[PDB]
Amino acid sequence: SHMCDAFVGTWKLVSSENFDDYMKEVGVGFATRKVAGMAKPNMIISVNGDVITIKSESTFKNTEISFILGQEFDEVTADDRKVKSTITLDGGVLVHVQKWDGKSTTIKRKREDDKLVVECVMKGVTSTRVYERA
Numbered sequence: 602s603h604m605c606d607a608f609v610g611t612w613k614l615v616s617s618e619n620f621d622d623y624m625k626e627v628g629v630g631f632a633t634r635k636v637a638g639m640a641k642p643n644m645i646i647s648v649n650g651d652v653i654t655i656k657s658e659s660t661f662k663n664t665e666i667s668f669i670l671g672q673e674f675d676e677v678t679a680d681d682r683k684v685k686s687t688i689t690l691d692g693g694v695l696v697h698v699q700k701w702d703g704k705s706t707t708i709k710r711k712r713e714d715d716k717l718v719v720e721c722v723m724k725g726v727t728s729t730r731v732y733e734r735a
């Protein structure tokens with residue numbers, strides 16, 4: 602057993618709050634906000650050795666990142682930002698920082714009861730997205 606066992610699996614979005622406002626704060630344009638905000642992604646998390654993979658599959662976009670904790674990587678986000686990302690585990694929470702154009706946003710993933718809760722923060726704006734096992 603290891604670091605991220607409780608995250609591994611296939612998860613489906615069941616609720617979202619304030620995501621349009623988060624996307625506005627990030628700089629996502631109108632059309633992308635509308636289509637992205639409609640999506641009901643599945644999130645697939647797996648681990649092989651030290652490499653964690655997070656896939657997001659939806660009608661909007663299919664994305665995949667693979668990474669080692671603490672080791673920076675280049676990421677093209679679903680809204681087409683080219684960012685430098687670093688993901689760490691802090692007290693059982695996966696903390697994903699993205700940097701681009703002198704800006705920064707943090708995405709936290711945590712297990713709470715049977716859910717996987719995703720908190721996205723840009724400056725003062727937070728969005729909460731709740732996923733359940735598929």
Ligand SMILES: Cc1ccc(Cc2cc(O)[nH]n2)cc1Oc1ccccc1
Nearest residue numbers: 637640642657659661679680719721730
């Ligand atoms: C533009 C954008 C910003 C932030 C995140 C962070 C996040 C939220 C979540 O539920 N998983 N990851 C995702 C994203 O794009 C997508 C939106 C919907 C479906 C697929 C991709």
